[PDB]
Coordinates of N, CA, C and O and ligand atoms in Angstrom, one line a residue:
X1 N -25.2 0.5 23.3 CA -25.9 -0.8 23.4 C -24.9 -2.0 23.3 O -24.2 -2.3 24.2
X2 N -25.0 -2.6 22.1 CA -24.1 -3.8 21.8 C -23.2 -3.5 20.7 O -22.6 -4.5 20.2
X3 N -23.1 -2.3 20.2 CA -22.2 -1.9 19.2 C -20.8 -1.4 19.7 O -20.0 -1.0 18.9
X4 N -20.6 -1.3 21.0 CA -19.4 -0.7 21.5 C -18.1 -1.5 21.1 O -17.2 -0.8 20.6
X5 N -18.1 -2.8 21.2 CA -17.0 -3.6 20.7 C -16.9 -3.7 19.2 O -15.9 -3.7 18.6
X6 N -18.1 -3.8 18.5 CA -18.2 -3.8 17.1 C -17.5 -2.5 16.5 O -16.7 -2.6 15.6
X7 N -17.9 -1.4 17.1 CA -17.2 -0.1 16.7 C -15.7 -0.1 17.0 O -14.9 0.1 16.2
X8 N -15.4 -0.5 18.3 CA -14.0 -0.6 18.7 C -13.2 -1.4 17.7 O -12.1 -0.9 17.2
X9 N -13.6 -2.6 17.4 CA -12.8 -3.5 16.5 C -12.9 -3.0 15.0 O -12.0 -3.3 14.3
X10 N -13.9 -2.2 14.7 CA -13.9 -1.5 13.4 C -12.8 -0.5 13.3 O -12.1 -0.4 12.3
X11 N -12.6 0.4 14.3 CA -11.6 1.4 14.3 C -10.2 0.8 14.2 O -9.3 1.3 13.5
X12 N -10.0 -0.4 14.9 CA -8.7 -1.0 14.9 C -8.4 -1.6 13.5 O -7.4 -1.3 13.0
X13 N -9.4 -2.3 12.9 CA -9.2 -2.9 11.6 C -8.8 -1.8 10.6 O -8.0 -2.1 9.6
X14 N -9.4 -0.6 10.7 CA -9.0 0.5 9.8 C -7.6 1.0 10.0 O -7.0 1.4 9.0
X15 N -7.1 1.0 11.2 CA -5.7 1.3 11.5 C -4.8 0.3 10.8 O -3.9 0.7 10.1
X16 N -5.1 -1.0 10.9 CA -4.3 -2.0 10.3 C -4.3 -1.9 8.8 O -3.2 -1.9 8.2
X17 N -5.4 -1.7 8.2 CA -5.5 -1.7 6.7 C -5.1 -0.4 6.1 O -4.6 -0.5 4.9
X18 N -5.3 0.7 6.7 CA -5.0 2.0 6.1 C -3.9 2.8 6.7 O -3.6 3.9 6.1
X19 N -3.3 2.3 7.7 CA -2.1 3.0 8.3 C -0.9 2.1 8.5 O 0.2 2.6 8.3
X20 N -1.2 0.9 8.8 CA -0.1 -0.1 9.0 C 0.3 -0.8 7.7 O 1.4 -0.9 7.3
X21 N -0.7 -1.4 7.1 CA -0.5 -2.2 5.9 C 0.0 -1.2 4.7 O 0.4 -1.7 3.7
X22 N -0.1 0.1 5.0 CA 0.3 1.1 4.0 C 1.8 1.5 4.2 O 2.3 2.3 3.3
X23 N 2.4 1.1 5.3 CA 3.8 1.4 5.4 C 4.6 0.9 4.3 O 4.4 -0.3 3.8
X24 N 5.5 1.7 3.7 CA 6.2 1.2 2.5 C 7.0 -0.1 2.8 O 7.7 -0.2 3.9
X25 N 7.0 -1.1 1.9 CA 7.7 -2.3 2.0 C 7.3 -3.1 3.3 O 8.1 -3.8 3.9
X26 N 6.0 -3.1 3.6 CA 5.5 -3.9 4.6 C 4.8 -5.2 4.0 O 4.1 -5.9 4.7
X27 N 5.2 -5.4 2.8 CA 5.0 -6.7 2.0 C 5.2 -7.9 2.9 O 4.3 -8.8 2.8
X28 N 6.2 -8.1 3.7 CA 6.5 -9.4 4.3 C 5.6 -9.7 5.5 O 5.3 -10.9 5.8
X29 N 5.2 -8.7 6.3 CA 4.4 -8.9 7.5 C 2.9 -9.0 7.3 O 2.2 -9.2 8.3
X30 N 2.4 -8.9 6.1 CA 1.0 -8.9 5.8 C 0.4 -10.3 6.2 O -0.6 -10.4 6.8
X31 N 1.1 -11.4 5.7 CA 0.6 -12.7 5.8 C 1.5 -13.6 6.7 O 2.7 -13.2 6.9
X32 N 1.0 -14.7 7.2 CA 1.9 -15.6 8.0 C 3.0 -16.2 7.1 O 2.7 -16.4 5.9
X33 N 4.1 -16.5 7.6 CA 5.2 -17.0 6.8 C 5.0 -18.5 6.6 O 4.5 -19.2 7.5
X34 N 5.4 -19.0 5.4 CA 5.3 -20.4 5.1 C 6.6 -21.1 5.6 O 7.7 -20.7 5.3
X35 N 6.4 -22.2 6.4 CA 7.5 -22.8 7.1 C 8.3 -23.7 6.2 O 9.5 -24.0 6.5
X36 N 7.9 -23.9 4.9 CA 8.7 -24.7 4.0 C 9.7 -23.8 3.3 O 10.6 -24.3 2.6
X37 N 9.6 -22.5 3.4 CA 10.5 -21.5 2.7 C 11.4 -20.8 3.7 O 12.3 -20.2 3.3
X38 N 11.1 -20.9 5.0 CA 11.9 -20.3 6.1 C 12.2 -21.4 7.1 O 11.3 -21.7 7.9
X39 N 13.3 -22.1 7.0 CA 13.5 -23.4 7.6 C 13.6 -23.4 9.1 O 13.7 -24.5 9.7
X40 N 13.6 -22.3 9.8 CA 13.7 -22.2 11.3 C 12.7 -21.5 12.0 O 12.5 -21.7 13.2
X41 N 11.9 -20.6 11.3 CA 11.0 -19.6 12.0 C 10.2 -20.2 13.1 O 10.3 -19.8 14.2
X42 N 9.3 -21.2 12.8 CA 8.3 -21.6 13.7 C 8.8 -22.4 14.9 O 8.0 -23.0 15.6
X43 N 10.1 -22.4 15.1 CA 10.7 -22.9 16.4 C 11.6 -22.0 17.0 O 11.8 -22.1 18.3
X44 N 12.3 -21.1 16.3 CA 13.0 -20.0 17.0 C 11.9 -19.0 17.5 O 12.1 -18.5 18.6
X45 N 10.9 -18.7 16.7 CA 9.9 -17.8 17.1 C 8.7 -18.6 17.7 O 8.0 -19.3 16.9
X46 N 8.6 -18.6 19.0 CA 7.6 -19.4 19.7 C 6.2 -18.9 19.4 O 5.2 -19.7 19.1
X47 N 6.0 -17.6 19.4 CA 4.7 -16.9 19.2 C 4.6 -16.1 17.9 O 5.0 -14.9 17.9
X48 N 4.2 -16.7 16.8 CA 4.2 -16.0 15.6 C 3.0 -15.0 15.5 O 2.0 -15.2 16.2
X49 N 3.2 -14.0 14.8 CA 2.2 -12.9 14.6 C 2.4 -12.2 13.3 O 3.5 -11.7 13.0
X50 N 1.3 -12.1 12.5 CA 1.3 -11.3 11.3 C 0.0 -10.4 11.3 O -0.8 -10.5 12.2
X51 N -0.1 -9.5 10.3 CA -1.2 -8.6 10.3 C -2.5 -9.2 9.8 O -3.6 -8.7 10.0
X52 N -2.4 -10.4 9.1 CA -3.6 -11.1 8.7 C -4.3 -11.8 9.9 O -5.5 -11.7 10.0
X53 N -3.5 -12.4 10.7 CA -4.1 -13.0 11.9 C -4.5 -12.0 12.9 O -5.4 -12.3 13.8
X54 N -4.0 -10.8 12.9 CA -4.5 -9.7 13.7 C -5.9 -9.3 13.3 O -6.8 -9.1 14.2
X55 N -6.1 -9.2 12.0 CA -7.5 -8.8 11.5 C -8.4 -10.0 11.8 O -9.6 -9.7 12.3
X56 N -8.0 -11.2 11.6 CA -8.9 -12.3 12.0 C -9.1 -12.4 13.5 O -10.1 -12.9 13.9
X57 N -8.2 -11.9 14.3 CA -8.4 -11.8 15.7 C -9.3 -10.6 16.0 O -10.0 -10.6 17.0
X58 N -9.2 -9.5 15.2 CA -10.1 -8.4 15.4 C -11.5 -8.8 15.2 O -12.4 -8.5 16.0
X59 N -11.8 -9.4 14.1 CA -13.1 -9.9 13.7 C -13.7 -10.8 14.7 O -14.9 -11.1 14.7
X60 N -12.9 -11.4 15.6 CA -13.4 -12.3 16.7 C -13.6 -11.5 17.9 O -13.9 -12.1 19.0
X61 N -13.5 -10.2 17.9 CA -13.6 -9.3 19.1 C -12.8 -9.8 20.2 O -13.3 -10.2 21.3
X62 N -11.5 -9.9 20.0 CA -10.5 -10.4 20.9 C -9.8 -9.3 21.7 O -9.5 -9.5 22.9
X63 N -9.7 -8.1 21.1 CA -9.0 -7.0 21.8 C -10.1 -6.1 22.4 O -10.8 -5.4 21.7
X64 N -10.1 -6.1 23.7 CA -11.0 -5.2 24.5 C -10.4 -3.9 24.9 O -11.1 -3.1 25.5
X65 N -9.1 -3.7 24.5 CA -8.5 -2.4 24.6 C -7.1 -2.5 24.0 O -6.7 -3.5 23.6
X66 N -6.5 -1.3 23.9 CA -5.2 -1.2 23.2 C -4.1 -2.0 23.9 O -3.2 -2.5 23.2
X67 N -4.2 -2.2 25.2 CA -3.1 -2.9 25.9 C -3.0 -4.3 25.4 O -1.9 -4.8 25.2
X68 N -4.1 -5.0 25.2 CA -4.1 -6.4 24.7 C -3.9 -6.3 23.2 O -3.3 -7.3 22.6
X69 N -4.3 -5.3 22.5 CA -4.0 -5.1 21.1 C -2.6 -4.7 20.8 O -1.9 -5.3 19.9
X70 N -2.0 -3.8 21.6 CA -0.6 -3.4 21.4 C 0.3 -4.6 21.7 O 1.4 -4.7 21.1
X71 N -0.2 -5.5 22.6 CA 0.6 -6.7 22.9 C 0.9 -7.5 21.6 O 2.1 -7.8 21.3
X72 N -0.1 -7.8 20.9 CA 0.0 -8.6 19.7 C 0.8 -7.9 18.6 O 1.7 -8.5 17.9
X73 N 0.6 -6.6 18.4 CA 1.3 -5.9 17.3 C 2.7 -5.6 17.7 O 3.6 -5.6 16.8
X74 N 3.0 -5.4 19.0 CA 4.4 -5.3 19.4 C 5.2 -6.6 19.2 O 6.4 -6.6 19.1
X75 N 4.5 -7.7 19.0 CA 5.2 -9.0 18.9 C 5.7 -9.3 17.5 O 6.6 -10.2 17.4
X76 N 5.3 -8.6 16.5 CA 5.9 -8.9 15.2 C 7.2 -8.1 15.0 O 8.0 -8.5 14.2
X77 N 7.4 -7.0 15.7 CA 8.7 -6.4 15.8 C 9.6 -7.1 16.7 O 10.8 -7.3 16.3
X78 N 9.1 -7.6 17.8 CA 9.9 -8.5 18.7 C 10.3 -9.8 17.9 O 11.4 -10.3 18.2
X79 N 9.5 -10.2 17.0 CA 9.8 -11.5 16.3 C 10.8 -11.2 15.2 O 11.6 -12.1 14.9
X80 N 10.8 -10.1 14.5 CA 11.7 -9.8 13.4 C 13.1 -9.5 14.0 O 14.1 -9.7 13.3
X81 N 13.2 -8.9 15.2 CA 14.5 -8.7 15.8 C 15.1 -10.0 16.4 O 16.3 -10.2 16.4
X82 N 14.2 -10.9 16.8 CA 14.6 -12.2 17.3 C 14.9 -13.2 16.1 O 15.3 -14.3 16.4
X83 N 14.7 -12.8 14.9 CA 15.0 -13.7 13.8 C 15.9 -13.0 12.7 O 16.7 -13.7 12.1
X84 N 15.8 -11.7 12.5 CA 16.6 -11.0 11.5 C 17.6 -10.1 12.1 O 18.4 -9.5 11.3
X85 N 17.6 -9.8 13.4 CA 18.6 -8.9 14.0 C 18.0 -7.5 14.0 O 17.2 -7.1 13.1
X86 N 18.4 -6.7 15.0 CA 17.8 -5.4 15.2 C 18.2 -4.4 14.1 O 17.5 -3.4 14.0
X87 N 19.1 -4.7 13.2 CA 19.5 -3.7 12.2 C 19.1 -4.2 10.8 O 19.3 -3.4 9.8
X88 N 18.4 -5.3 10.7 CA 17.9 -5.7 9.4 C 16.8 -4.8 8.8 O 16.1 -4.2 9.6
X89 N 16.7 -4.8 7.5 CA 15.7 -3.9 6.9 C 14.3 -4.4 7.2 O 13.4 -3.6 7.3
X90 N 14.1 -5.7 7.3 CA 12.9 -6.3 7.8 C 12.5 -5.7 9.2 O 11.4 -5.3 9.4
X91 N 13.5 -5.8 10.1 CA 13.2 -5.2 11.5 C 13.0 -3.7 11.4 O 12.1 -3.2 12.1
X92 N 13.7 -3.0 10.6 CA 13.5 -1.6 10.4 C 12.1 -1.3 9.9 O 11.5 -0.3 10.4
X93 N 11.7 -2.1 9.0 CA 10.3 -1.9 8.5 C 9.2 -2.2 9.5 O 8.2 -1.5 9.6
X94 N 9.5 -3.2 10.3 CA 8.6 -3.6 11.4 C 8.5 -2.5 12.5 O 7.5 -2.3 13.1
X95 N 9.7 -1.8 12.6 CA 9.7 -0.7 13.6 C 8.8 0.5 13.2 O 8.2 1.1 14.0
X96 N 8.6 0.6 11.9 CA 7.8 1.7 11.4 C 6.3 1.3 11.3 O 5.4 2.1 11.5
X97 N 6.0 0.0 11.1 CA 4.7 -0.5 11.3 C 4.2 -0.3 12.7 O 3.1 0.2 13.0
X98 N 5.1 -0.5 13.7 CA 4.7 -0.3 15.1 C 4.6 1.2 15.4 O 3.7 1.7 16.1
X99 N 5.5 2.0 14.7 CA 5.5 3.5 15.0 C 4.2 4.1 14.5 O 3.6 4.9 15.2
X100 N 3.8 3.8 13.2 CA 2.6 4.4 12.7 C 1.3 4.0 13.5 O 0.3 4.7 13.5
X101 N 1.4 2.8 14.1 CA 0.3 2.3 14.9 C 0.3 2.9 16.3 O -0.7 2.7 17.0
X102 N 1.3 3.6 16.7 CA 1.3 4.3 18.0 C 0.8 5.7 17.9 O 0.0 6.1 18.8
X103 N 1.2 6.5 16.9 CA 0.7 7.8 16.7 C -0.8 7.8 16.4 O -1.6 8.6 16.9
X104 N -1.2 6.8 15.6 CA -2.6 6.7 15.3 C -3.5 6.3 16.4 O -4.6 6.8 16.6
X105 N -3.0 5.5 17.4 CA -3.8 5.1 18.5 C -3.9 6.2 19.5 O -4.9 6.3 20.2
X106 N -2.9 7.1 19.6 CA -3.0 8.3 20.4 C -3.5 9.5 19.6 O -3.7 10.6 20.1
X107 N -3.6 9.4 18.2 CA -4.3 10.4 17.5 C -5.8 10.3 17.6 O -6.5 11.3 17.5
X108 N -6.3 9.1 17.8 CA -7.7 8.8 18.2 C -7.8 8.5 19.7 O -8.7 7.7 20.1
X109 N -6.9 9.1 20.5 CA -6.8 8.6 21.9 C -8.0 8.7 22.7 O -8.6 7.7 23.1
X110 N -8.5 10.0 22.9 CA -9.7 10.2 23.8 C -10.9 9.4 23.3 O -11.5 8.7 24.1
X111 N -11.2 9.4 22.0 CA -12.3 8.7 21.5 C -12.2 7.2 21.7 O -13.2 6.5 22.0
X112 N -11.0 6.7 21.6 CA -10.8 5.3 21.9 C -10.9 5.0 23.4 O -11.4 4.0 23.9
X113 N -10.4 6.0 24.3 CA -10.5 5.8 25.7 C -11.9 5.7 26.2 O -12.1 5.1 27.3
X114 N -12.9 6.2 25.5 CA -14.3 6.2 25.9 C -14.9 4.8 25.6 O -15.6 4.2 26.4
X115 N -14.6 4.3 24.4 CA -15.1 3.0 24.0 C -14.6 1.9 25.0 O -15.3 0.9 25.3
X116 N -13.4 2.1 25.5 CA -12.8 1.1 26.4 C -13.5 1.0 27.8 O -13.7 0.0 28.4
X117 N -14.0 2.2 28.2 CA -14.8 2.3 29.4 C -16.1 1.6 29.2 O -16.6 0.8 30.0
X118 N -16.7 1.9 28.0 CA -18.1 1.4 27.7 C -18.1 -0.1 27.6 O -19.0 -0.7 28.2
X119 N -17.2 -0.7 26.8 CA -17.2 -2.1 26.7 C -17.1 -2.9 28.0 O -17.7 -3.9 28.3
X120 N -16.2 -2.4 28.9 CA -15.9 -3.1 30.1 C -16.9 -2.8 31.2 O -17.1 -3.7 32.1
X121 N -17.5 -1.6 31.3 CA -18.6 -1.4 32.2 C -19.7 -2.4 31.9 O -20.4 -2.8 32.8
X122 N -20.0 -2.6 30.6 CA -21.0 -3.6 30.3 C -20.5 -5.0 30.8 O -21.4 -5.8 31.3
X123 N -19.3 -5.3 30.7 CA -18.8 -6.6 31.2 C -18.7 -6.6 32.8 O -18.9 -7.7 33.4
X124 N -18.3 -5.5 33.4 CA -18.5 -5.3 34.8 C -20.0 -5.6 35.2 O -20.2 -6.5 36.0
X125 N -20.9 -4.8 34.7 CA -22.3 -4.8 35.1 C -22.9 -6.2 34.8 O -23.7 -6.7 35.6
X126 N -22.5 -6.9 33.7 CA -23.0 -8.2 33.4 C -22.7 -9.2 34.6 O -23.5 -10.1 34.9
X127 N -21.5 -9.0 35.2 CA -21.1 -9.9 36.3 C -21.9 -9.5 37.6 O -22.3 -10.4 38.4
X128 N -22.0 -8.2 37.9 CA -22.7 -7.7 39.1 C -24.2 -7.5 38.8 O -25.0 -8.4 38.6
Ligands
NQP1 C1 5.5 -12.1 10.7 C2 6.3 -11.7 9.8 C3 7.4 -12.5 9.2 C4 8.3 -11.6 8.3 N1 9.4 -12.4 7.6 C5 10.5 -12.7 8.4 O1 10.6 -12.3 9.5 C6 11.5 -13.6 7.7 C7 11.2 -15.1 8.1 N2 11.6 -13.5 6.3 C8 12.9 -13.7 5.7 C9 13.1 -15.0 4.9 C10 14.6 -15.1 4.5 O2 14.9 -13.9 3.7 C11 14.9 -12.7 4.5 C12 13.5 -12.5 4.9 C13 10.4 -13.3 5.6 N3 10.3 -13.7 4.3 C14 9.2 -13.5 3.6 N4 9.1 -13.9 2.3 C15 10.0 -13.7 1.3 C16 11.2 -13.0 1.4 C17 12.0 -12.8 0.4 C18 11.7 -13.3 -0.9 C19 12.7 -13.1 -2.0 O3 13.6 -12.2 -1.9 N5 12.6 -13.9 -3.1 C20 13.6 -14.1 -4.0 C21 13.3 -13.4 -5.4 C22 14.4 -13.7 -6.4 N6 14.7 -15.1 -6.6 C23 15.7 -15.3 -7.6 C24 15.0 -15.8 -5.3 C25 13.9 -15.6 -4.3 C26 10.6 -14.0 -1.0 C27 9.7 -14.2 0.0 O4 8.5 -14.9 -0.1 C28 8.2 -15.6 -1.3 C29 8.0 -13.0 4.3 C30 8.1 -12.6 5.6 C31 9.3 -12.8 6.3

């Protein structure tokens, strides 16, 4: 009915909270960075992204499939390599946040693939 996206965004939020925010030493990427303590971030990094704004984006039902969801989560690893270098421990930790979020999205792959058809057929049909 009208629970397709509510369910979808529920499964995503649980990935963030119980598989990504649980990566060891993912302390830094949980919240947005304060610009008074990092004097260059918000102008070297044009598109900031943290896991708190991803959840607040999830609760707004913004991700209608993993492609738009993976876009945002891939951006915090792209942001740490563009600010800390590809070999920094921060970047290495962001690589594992992205990694745990990839096995988990294909560990629930089929079941997720069906919700994506359901949500969009509703948006297809609503137009036609
Ligand atoms: C989107 C994700 C952005 C992820 N991200 C980055 O991508 C970049 C911007 N960083 C950098 C900033 C520069 O340091 C390397 C990490 C982040 N920093 C922090 N925050 C802190 C880092 C280190 C310390 C510290 O060690 N404190 C010291 C303790 C000991 N006393 C004597 C001195 C202070 C504290 C932090 O918050 C309070 C948070 C996030 C980042």
